Ligand binder design. Sequence first.
Ligand SMILES: Cc1cc2nc3c(=O)[nH]c(=O)nc-3n(C[C@H](O)[C@H](O)[C@H](O)COP(=O)(O)O)c2cc1C
Length: 147
Amino acid sequence: TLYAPGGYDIMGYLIQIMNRPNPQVELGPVDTSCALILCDLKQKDTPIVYASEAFLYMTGYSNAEVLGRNCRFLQSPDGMVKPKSTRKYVDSNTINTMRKAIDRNAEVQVEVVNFKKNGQRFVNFLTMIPVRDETGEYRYSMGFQCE
Ligand SMILES: Cc1cc2nc3c(=O)[nH]c(=O)nc-3n(C[C@H](O)[C@H](O)[C@H](O)COP(=O)(O)O)c2cc1C
């Protein structure tokens, strides 16, 4: 996975999200002190390109451990999850709901069982919102995690 030199406009994307004209989900106000990640929709398998400190701390993973991976690794206490695999700890419909939303650039909000690096189970109230870059096309997805 490639990462933008000098980083991502996380604050600008938060503002874009808070200002979005027809919010389909209730997110409320958010900021950089929240558990959030940004994933790149135009790299293979939608890799994490940015993780906030609060995400790293909620999950127990380091920046080196998370960047460049699809976030589905959180769905197993091993951190090992193949795409299209049936999940042991998440129901199929929730997984499919997330995938379809992301593919359609549709906002979605789910509750999913996730696991910290130490294997501790937690319930993740997850909101994903697509984000337009400077071209005006949907390029990223910003995910907001709550425990
Ligand atoms: C911005 C963003 C944040 C995500 N955060 C999480 C998360 O915290 N936990 C999780 O279980 N899945 C998360 N996902 C969902 C998975 O990465 C993946 O999209 C989901 O498993 C459905 O796709 P799949 O069928 O390829 O696995 C996130 C996805 C995106 C794009």
